[PDB]
Amino acid sequence: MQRNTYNKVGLYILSLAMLFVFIIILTAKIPFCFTSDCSFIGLKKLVLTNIVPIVCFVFFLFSIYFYNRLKNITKYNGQDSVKITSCQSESYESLTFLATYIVPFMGFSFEDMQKNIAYLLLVVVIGIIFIKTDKYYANPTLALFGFKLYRVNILHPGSGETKNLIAISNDVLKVDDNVYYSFFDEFVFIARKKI
């Protein structure tokens, strides 16, 4: 594993952050009582009656750490420029991804621990197939933070015309525009317009 495999694992864990916070808001069972008789039941009973909340909380922390690792990519050298030849926008992913792989988990009942073990195994299976299927750039947590995904064909000033690269830009992109590349992998790079 490792290297590219760890990068795709980090992208998938960052993608599932909306699922983690959705399970957090759906099933928490926090005693939100506005009366004086609802005292503290104890820390041990609270952490016993809540298992998948704290599991999803440390998974959300893992997703935040992997988003920090993705934001570390643009910190170093990205001071080179290319020219976009084709700018066919592919941003219906991370909406198709959400409405296909997250809405069923909202349509799923979280009552028994056997069922939760089965759903975690389903998450692991979906991630394992999602590792190596070249649709790994779909990321609703990325699309919430202003990022719009594009399928671009850059043209280097001195190397050549490399084709079929995926750009994650902060703003809109267009044919005959200059962006700054910071390659997270061979296929996906974080873009930034030059103006």
């Binding site: 050298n77 080179d80 000033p157 001195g158 190397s159 590349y181």
Partner: protein, 315 residues
């Protein structure tokens, strides 16, 4: 390519500035790319742009002669014109066209002991400029003498950082434009790029031509001096661009030495009146400069002059 067209191409790269990229070459002959911080890379790009502007753009006294006509002038970028390219030049040409989605990134756990040179790829207006650098002995430097784990110390014994720091000062040894290579520093090219054997082979050809010219009485003095690289530069210049050796008869040369104010008292004619006695190092240097056509007089002031840096005017 003249100097004005070179200035125009450098200007056309500079004002339509696109961006830079730093590529390391290694001792095992492969190309890796580095992880430089954004503000540090911006400062490097601005410093290299300022140095390149002071060298070509704002410089009025710029000349670009061929490396086979290498004199000892300053503020010049010598043009490569030899047939055989060294392997670092081909590695520069390969480093121009590395695709931007490459993943052969440099590993900084090697403590920077494997990097042989630093290639700066200044790009702009669909053209690539490839500066070159050499890593010296860490560019010897200092520290602050942390007293235990705290930085300020008025009693600070000034010490050196260990073998982990790379020099990236604002200077370049040679740069690449288009398909031509221009050279600024000659010592790193004669040392690191394995070029002094080519210079020595050209010196061997020049010594063979001097022996066949049937002029020097004692060949073995010139052969004795020929192992020096600074002398071998002059035999390379003699082999490729001498306008007196072989063009004219030797009798005119010996008449010129017999009819001069300075050469008659330095270079001595033999007893038979056909050879030149060249024994001392001073006589060797004066004969080399005589065969290099460095003894010129003015038709205005009638003053004989030595010329360290010459230029043929009909060019």
């Amino acid at each position: 390519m003249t100097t004005q067209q070179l200035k125009e191409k450098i200007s056309k790269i500079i004002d339509n500035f696109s961006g830079i990229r730093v590529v390391f070459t290694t001792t095992a002959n492969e190309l890796k790319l580095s992880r430089i911080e954004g503000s540090a890379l911006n400062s490097i790009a601005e410093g290299f742009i300022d140095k390149i502007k002071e060298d070509i753009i704002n410089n009025e006294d710029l000349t670009s002669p061929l490396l086979s006509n290498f004199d000892d002038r300053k503020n010049a970028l010598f043009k490569f014109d030899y047939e055989q390219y060294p392997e670092e030049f081909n590695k520069i040409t390969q480093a121009i066209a590395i695709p931007p989605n490459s993943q052969d990134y440099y590993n900084p756990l090697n403590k920077f002991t494997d990097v042989k040179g630093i290639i700066i790829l200044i790009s702009g207006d669909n053209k690539c400029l490839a500066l070159y650098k050499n890593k010296t002995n860490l560019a010897v430097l200092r520290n602050s003498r942390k007293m235990f784990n705290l930085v300020p110390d008025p009693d600070g014994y000034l010490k050196q950082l260990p073998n982990e720091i790379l020099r990236l000062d604002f200077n370049y040894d040679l740069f690449s434009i288009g398909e031509d290579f221009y050279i600024k520093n000659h010592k790193t090219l004669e040392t690191q790029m394995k070029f002094h054997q080519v210079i020595e082979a050209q010196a061997v050809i020049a010594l063979n031509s001097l022996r066949d010219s049937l002029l020097i009485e004692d060949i073995s003095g010139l052969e004795k001096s020929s192992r020096e690289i600074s002398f071998a530069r002059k035999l390379a210049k003699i082999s490729k661009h001498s306008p007196v050796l072989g063009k004219i008869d030797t009798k005119t040369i010996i008449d010129y030495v017999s009819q001069h104010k300075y050469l008659s008292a330095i270079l001595q004619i033999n007893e038979a009146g056909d050879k030149l006695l060249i024994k001392t190092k001073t006589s060797q240097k004066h004969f080399i400069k005589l065969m290099s056509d460095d003894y010129l007089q003015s038709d205005l002031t009638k003053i004989i002059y030595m010329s360290i840096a010459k230029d043929r005017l009909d060019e």
